Design a protein around this ligand. Structure first.
Ligand code: B12
Ligand SMILES: CC(C)C(=O)SCCNC(=O)CCNC(=O)[C@H](O)C(C)(C)COP(=O)(O)OP(=O)(O)OC[C@H]1O[C@@H](n2cnc3c(N)ncnc32)[C@H](O)[C@@H]1OP(=O)(O)O
Ligand SMILES: CC(C)C(=O)SCCNC(=O)CCNC(=O)[C@H](O)C(C)(C)COP(=O)(O)OP(=O)(O)OC[C@H]1O[C@@H](n2cnc3c(N)ncnc32)[C@H](O)[C@@H]1OP(=O)(O)O
Ligand SMILES: Nc1nc2c(ncn2[C@@H]2O[C@H](COP(=O)(O)OP(=O)(O)O)[C@@H](O)[C@H]2O)c(=O)[nH]1
Ligand SMILES: C[C@H]1O[C@@H](n2cnc3c(N)ncnc32)[C@H](O)[C@@H]1O
Ligand SMILES: [Mg+2]
Ligand SMILES: [Mg+2]
Lengths: 1062, 158, 232
């Protein structure tokens, strides 16, 4: 048995917070214990969460806040709840080590029920927390329900929400119920039913339709939304996952309640009561979404005034439509996901079927209420067409509405002709798998030939040394000279010459020898001493020396002389403070390698504001950058156009906007440098030469990997498709201006890993995402050798064995595929990547132990010849690195690179039986995962089903189940605890109050400066999206007169918002 | 230095021996039957030492041992089974002792003589077959008179 | 037979390993010349080495094992138990410094790692100056626990084997040790060399050379001669 009452929760992550890994495994335990969970997903303001909890009438709220600003956040929520009749709703929180003990006691004293620390998780266990959390919220909310309809009819939306909880639980008085239906009948409001197959897009299409209603009627309509999702009878509760897709329901005139079927039927047993309740609440329209219905299911029809059947082009044979009961009753049919293959033919089958069912032979098949929609697409003309149709039908059915402001267009089918990856190339990942496996098959065969060839000629020389000469052997040998390929033959031929190269003290110049205190010569690159030419060729093909195909041991011959791979992530407070931290890290280093971390506000493209939702997060967890002037200040004193200076900005959603700021900054620096070296402004021609030169030589990297946002980090603000569109615009801009030093995208999986994915999943997903971009650009008309060298990677290094060979595997898979499959050049076959030590592998308990783990992870990174390395501080679980903390992190790299003896060799991994076996295993495991994604429609197709997110969250749970368990030993956490129990007072990296006020004053000053050109520039930006030009090209001008928030919100009106994917 | 000189010489012999018999099998597969090769091969069977010959002979049997999930070896009248596999969170089988995948019997013998598996001469990779599981941290104590040092001994070792 | 002090005094890994094996073989010859049997005292012989940052330390243990096993078998004709050299490795104390004491846990980790990789029989870990506090000894004890229990590569018991670097280093260090044997032999054996103070002299020579390059800025020591504390 589950809880005593019908226990409901609202779960979400705090505002501008992408950390869902924590909250996701909580709503899973909640659901399994028998709770209905209305999951809102990541990035939710207080105003959002409270509104939801109030409309759903829940007993509890669970929020995860890892960005900081949690004190202000929860206080706001507690205040807002009490103010709007939700004092009895309990609030639970968690942020791991971010929420220090003092802040927990403060928040719990303020009103928060419980906030769970990592130490609480260890003591109570995963299920223990949720049990405690659920047992608290096990209360009957029907006592708060109104006894008369006076409140509800008046317009009280909170009373309505509570009346529904009474009606649903059947604790409403019979005389009240009949009185409700009596007024519901006289109410005469239209009830739109939206049903269809599972995952067809019912929720997404509903949200879009509501958006249409708002834009068309200037938000004058009062709409009630009743979404029903199927309930697992085993647990008792359900995962009501419809509200998470709704982005247009955030408005006082919109009300939404999530119902569980509670019958493992497609409608709640009290649905007619709930509908009637909304009708009596004087709503202009009631919309009802059902759960996944079968072919012969149509229970929504008798409860609504209009019914809409939603389907996808994938329905099998055309004869299947004769079995679908809903096609016989539906007033409107929407074929959503019209981007899928065979959408047009699907429409012609459905159209003809509806024509047959209505016996309208005297009508055209194209005139039937069958619409081809694409809800995923922003401002889809298809959806608008369906909307126009619904309006005409709702109008005749007594519903006053003003003459619309929307494009009253004609047609039944969407005209969205955009494609990221053509259906012809759908199985691209599978082909890549074949390519790699095919390469290895050749290595085996060519080795056997090279081996046999040597064995023969060896025996021939031994026979002649004894007397008996047999030319019969030579015939078989010469036979295998031709059997060997041209490339393979030259490999073995250059082998003795190759050995003589790496033998001496120099490489004709580069030194090969570093001598120890003992007087031992440590060769930078150690060559094998095989006699078998089979082993030589096998080695040369599978793992050649660093700087030779397939670049397994590194893409470069020898490691950089002065520029170490070190690149420390940094960001705190305003641009002024971070500019200090940059100078701290890069102090005493000729090569300035910066890595910038932005605050949660900037990461979501928002300007700093006074509201406690946002204000408390400004300057925390990263530098607050809102204007070009902030960006300039951030890198002041750093010559961005200097060859030995590279800047790595970690930004995803607003990445194009931030990149435009950086580019403008690098340009303006050289304009200032010229104005100083000449004492005059450069002419229009001089400036044009300077501006163009900057773009070509500017060295750095912008993350921007949107594919990983949907899957891992959740920093996607615009719609996925729009983000990918603009990301391409950036790469096109780079090509035109010959930006050959900047990396347009750091294809990452670190985030995917930190979410919980094991090294195999991380590596596979990341390479898959990378290959997706390749296919995307290839289908977009760019030469493979034009964008491939601009592709950067990012990985995580944890404690798992596979991490030791993660980099070398990624290099080989890339090199082989780029050569054989895509036929690209050498620069393209070379995969360069950044490795950051695993942050989740570090804990809040016994923080001194983390330096041990971060050392081991940093070691295998350097051993495997990484291109760039970040080291995590010991206080990783609690705060952004302190001045003392970042030095310990920076010392780990310095000690390994300078002091550590084995490190004096640049290929110590090579030869190792374990490394070579692990390399082969991990590689094949990755290839198999490629095939799993390929049979799900590619990366995009898998994302459509939430395959990656599902697999990540599953592995996250599996790990976490073991961490608390004890099966997976974690020193200082689940074993070898402290007899004292010390996790004292540690220094924390929060932002100064003055710094917050500074950013606000700087912003309003910047705004006042370009107040004239502001609206005009933003208008140009939206026209760039409408006319479908290059967005980034406009951003290069936009960031000069517009703030980060202004640009983001302008793009929202034309590029839409990200639809969360659970 | 004398030992290593032998490793070089015995490897060359083991290598040549394989190369000959390999060529002999390839000639017979084409039709030509030249036993002149076999004479040079059998000549190197004697050239190889007794110990070296047995090393290569036990190599395929050695591989089958470290291949499975367990290590069966019967001492006295009973037996002592030991696990070879530790599985990662990803589901990867990490073998306790990883054997080389050489085809050249020259490299096999060279490896077996210079660096045999842990628990085999010359014990380069360790004197024991597999590491002990589980505590081995000694309890050091020594201060003041014999009474104080004793108490600490008794206290730590409680 | 210990070599902890010999290295700690300043001797590089080659000198340490060579002198220690030489001392060990001296005991063997000493006991043999009392008319004793080799299989009676050889299994009782224990060894004790230092693991520093130098490259040679990565293969110090495996070299000692092979040199012992080969000589005990071929030269002295002893049994299997005698050919097996068991040793304790303690992380270098000299390699840890008073400046920036938090850095020492990094060095002690790396040294503990190659010890375990090379399949040592017993390992001591050094704490991060002051008295051996119960907190400081826990950080030292955690280094071993983390590597043995959490670290992934450690799940394999011969990760060194196969490595081109390891096998080349093993051969080099071995021969370097053998050459040092010959230097001691032409000085009258270990006892004869001690008579001239050869070992002491050579240890002292290397201790000075190290201490020189350290001050010279030539041998980088993080937190000591480079990347020094900007506050203290
Ligand atoms: C994984 C992780 C990420 C992943 C997130 C993946 C995902 N999809 O969630 C990635 C790599 C994407 C990431 C990114 C960022 N992160 Co981060 N991340 C972490 C990390 C390593 C662990 C957090 C985690 O998920 N832990 C797993 C959970 C399950 O365990 P736990 O935290 O110990 O929680 C326990 C209890 O507290 C309890 N509990 C916790 N929450 C809840 C909730 C409920 C309802 C209940 C009942 C219980 C409960 O359950 C657990 C039981 O053991 C932490 C550091 C750390 N190790 O603590 C940094 C950390 C949280 N991140 C940090 C930052 C700054 C960021 C970035 C903003 C960096 C940047 N500037 O770009 C980005 C962007 C985030 C975004 N997109 O908005 C900082 C926070 C600094 C601060 N707030 O002062 C941290 C502390 C790292 C650091 N030291 O700098 N992050
Ligand atoms: C919120 C959290 C979770 C995060 O997401 S934190 C994210 C942190 N991310 C990062 O720090 C990403 C960092 N990565 C990068 O900057 C890039 O991916 C990068 C490729 C590693 C950049 O490395 P760089 O030091 O700039 O080296 P490169 O760009 O390759 O070198 C420039 C040129 O120098 C030359 N070069 C560089 N290195 C060498 C070597 N070793 N040999 C020879 N020549 C060399 C060469 O000519 C290079 O250009 P090509 O002719 O095109 O080959
Ligand atoms: O005394 P310890 O050395 O601690 O061990 C007890 C015995 O186990 C043996 N031992 C200790 N560790 C191991 C491992 N890892 N494998 C096999 N045998 C071992 C050790 O040689 C002793 O045997 P004998 O000398 O033959 O009596
Ligand atoms: N390819 C494509 N995917 C869509 C479209 N509309 C919605 N989706 C996706 O389909 C998934 C499920 O959507 P959802 O609204 O929850 O469907 P529901 O469960 O039936 O209500 C999500 O990943 C949506 O992004 C579309 O027009 N095309
Ligand atoms: C998400 C991961 O990024 C790193 N990280 C996050 N924020 C910062 C910051 N301000 N400074 C340095 N590193 C940071 C940590 O290692 C964390 O685990
Ligand atoms: Mg839905
Ligand atoms: Mg639904």
């Amino acid at each position: 048995r589950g809880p005593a009452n019908k226990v409901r929760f609202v779960t979400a992550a705090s505002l501008f917070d992408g950390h869902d890994a924590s909250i996701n495994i909580m709503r899973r335990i909640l659901q399994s214990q028998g709770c209905e969970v209305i999951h809102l997903g990541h990035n939710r303001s207080v105003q959002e969460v409270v509104t939801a909890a109030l409309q759903e009438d829940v007993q509890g709220i669970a929020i995860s806040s890892y960005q900081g600003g949690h004190v202000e956040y929860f206080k706001y929520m507690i205040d807002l709840l009490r103010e709007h009749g939700g004092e009895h709703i309990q609030v639970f929180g968690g942020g791991g080590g971010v929420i220090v003990p003092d802040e927990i006691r403060e928040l719990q004293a303020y009103g928060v029920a419980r906030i769970y620390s990592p130490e609480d998780g260890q003591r109570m266990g995963l299920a223990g927390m949720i049990t405690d959390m659920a047992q608290r919220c096990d209360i009957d909310l029907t006592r708060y329900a109104p006894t008369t309809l006076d409140t509800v009819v008046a317009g009280d939306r909170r009373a309505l929400a509570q009346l529904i909880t009474a009606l649903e639980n059947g604790k409403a008085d019979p005389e009240l119920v009949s009185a409700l239906h009596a007024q519901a009948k006289a109410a005469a409001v239209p009830v739109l039913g939206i049903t269809g197959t599972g995952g067809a897009g019912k929720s997404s299409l509903t949200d879009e339709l509501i958006r249409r209603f708002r834009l068309d009627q200037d938000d004058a309509l009062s709409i009630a939304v009743i979404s029903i999702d199927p309930s697992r009878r085993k647990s008792g509760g359900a995962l009501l996952g419809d509200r998470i897709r709704m982005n247009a329901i955030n408005h006082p005139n919109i009300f939404m309640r999530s119902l569980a079927t509670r019958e493992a039927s497609e409608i709640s047993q009290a649905l007619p009561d709930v509908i009637a309740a909304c009708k009596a609440a004087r709503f202009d329209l009631v919309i009802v979404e059902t759960s996944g219905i079968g072919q012969g299911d149509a229970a929504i029809v008798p409860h609504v005034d209009l019914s809409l059947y939603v389907m996808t082009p994938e329905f099998g044979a055309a004869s299947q439509l004769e079995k679908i009961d809903m096609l016989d009753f539906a007033d409107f049919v929407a074929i959503n996901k019209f981007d899928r293959k065979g959408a047009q033919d699907a429409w012609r089958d459905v159209a003809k079927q509806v024509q047959r069912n209505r016996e309208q032979w005297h009508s055209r098949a194209e005139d039937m209420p069958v619409y081809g929609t694409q809800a995923s697409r922003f401002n889809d003309d298809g959806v608008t067409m369906l909307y126009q149709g619904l309006v005409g039908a709702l109008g005749a059915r007594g519903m006053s509405l003003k003459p619309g402001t929307l494009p009253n267009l004609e047609g039944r089918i969407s005209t969205g002709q955009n494609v990221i990856v053509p259906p012809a190339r759908s199985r691209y990942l599978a082909e890549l798998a074949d390519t790699v496996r095919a390469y290895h098959r050749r290595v085996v065969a060519q080795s056997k030939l090279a081996r046999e060839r040597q064995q023969l000629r060896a025996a021939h020389d031994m026979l002649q040394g004894a007397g008996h000469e047999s030319a019969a052997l030579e015939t078989l040998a010469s036979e295998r000279d031709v059997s060997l390929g041209a490339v393979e033959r030259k490999l073995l031929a250059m082998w003795p010459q190759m050995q003589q190269a790496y033998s001496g003290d120099e490489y004709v110049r580069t030194g090969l020898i570093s001598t120890t205190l003992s007087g031992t010569k440590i060769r930078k690159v150690v060559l094998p001493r095989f006699e078998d030419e089979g082993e030589i060729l096998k080695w040369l093909m599978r793992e050649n020396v660093p700087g030779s195909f397939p670049y397994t041991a590194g893409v470069f011959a020898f490691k950089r002389e002065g520029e170490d791979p070190t690149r420390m992530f940094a960001g705190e407070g305003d641009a002024f403070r971070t500019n200090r931290r940059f100078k701290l890290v890069s102090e005493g280093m000729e090569a300035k390698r910066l890595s910038t971390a932005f605050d949660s506000v900037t990461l979501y493209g928002e300007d700093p504001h006074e509201r406690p939702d946002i204000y408390g997060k400004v300057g925390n967890s990263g530098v607050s950058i809102a204007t070009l002037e902030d960006m300039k200040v951030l890198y002041d004193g750093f010559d961005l156009t200097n060859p030995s200076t590279s800047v790595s900005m970690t930004i995803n959603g607003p990445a194009p906007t931030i990149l435009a700021m950086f580019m403008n900054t690098a340009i303006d620096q050289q304009i200032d440098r010229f104005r100083a070296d000449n004492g005059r402004d450069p002419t229009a021609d001089e400036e044009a030469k300077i501006r163009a030169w900057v773009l070509q030589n500017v060295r750095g990297t912008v993350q921007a990997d949107i594919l990983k946002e949907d899957q891992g980090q959740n920093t996607c603000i615009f719609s996925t498709e729009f983000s990918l569109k603009v990301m391409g615009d950036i790469q096109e801009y780079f090509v035109h201006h010959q930006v050959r030093n900047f990396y347009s995208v750091s294809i990452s999986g670190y985030h995917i890993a930190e979410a919980g994915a094991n090294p195999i999943s991380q590596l596979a997903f990341t390479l898959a995402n990378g290959f997706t971009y390749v296919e995307a650009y290839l289908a977009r008309g760019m030469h493979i050798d034009d964008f491939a060298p601009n592709l950067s990677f990012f990985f995580s290094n944890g404690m798992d064995p596979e991490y030791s060979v993660l980099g070398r595997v990624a290099r080989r898979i890339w090199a082989v595929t780029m050569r054989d499959k895509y036929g690209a050049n050498d620069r393209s076959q070379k995969l360069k990547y950044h490795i950051q030590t695993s942050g989740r592998s570090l804990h809040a308990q016994e923080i001194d132990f983390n330096d041990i783990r971060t050392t081991l992870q940093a070691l295998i990174a350097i051993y495997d010849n990484c291109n760039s390395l970040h080291t995590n501080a010991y206080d990783e679980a609690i705060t952004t690195p302190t001045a003392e903390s970042v030095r310990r992190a920076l010392a780990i790299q310095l000690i390994i690179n300078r002091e550590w003896g084995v490190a004096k060799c640049e290929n110590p991994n090579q030869g190792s039986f374990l490394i070579e076996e692990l390399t082969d295993l991990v590689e094949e495991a990755v290839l198999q995962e490629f095939e799993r994604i390929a049979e799900r429609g590619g990366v995009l197709g898998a994302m459509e089903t939430g395959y990656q997110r599902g697999k990540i969250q599953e592995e996250s749970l599996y790990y976490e189940q073991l961490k608390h368990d004890g099966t997976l030993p974690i020193i200082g956490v689940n074993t070898f605890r402290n007899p004292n129990g010390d996790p004292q007072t540690l220094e924390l990296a929060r932002s100064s109050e003055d710094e917050k006020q500074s950013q606000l004053h700087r912003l309003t000053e910047f705004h006042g400066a370009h107040q004239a050109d502001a609206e005009a520039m933003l208008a140009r930006l939206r026209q760039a999206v409408i006319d479908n030009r290059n967005v980034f090209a406009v951003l290069m001008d936009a960031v000069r007169v517009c703030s980060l928030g202004q640009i983001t919100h302008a793009l929202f009106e034309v590029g839409g918002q990200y639809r969360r994917n659970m | 230095r004398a030992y290593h000189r032998r490793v070089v010489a015995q490897s060359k012999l083991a290598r040549e021996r394989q190369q000959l018999r390999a060529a002999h099998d390839m000639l017979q597969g084409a039709g030509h039957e030249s036993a002149a090769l076999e004479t040079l091969a059998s000549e190197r069977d004697v050239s190889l030492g007794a110990v070296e010959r047995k090393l290569l002979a036990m190599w395929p049997q050695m591989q089958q041992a470290y291949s499975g999930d367990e290590y069966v070896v019967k001492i006295r009248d009973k037996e002592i089974r030991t696990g070879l596999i530790s599985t990662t969170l990803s589901g990867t089988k990490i073998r306790k002792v990883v054997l080389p995948r050489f085809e050249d019997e020259g490299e096999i013998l060279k490896w077996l003589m210079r660096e045999n598996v842990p628990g085999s001469f010359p014990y380069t990779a360790g004197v024991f077959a597999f590491k002990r599981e589980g505590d081995p941290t000694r309890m050091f104590a020594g201060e003041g008179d014999a009474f104080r040092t004793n108490r600490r001994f008794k206290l730590v070792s409680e």
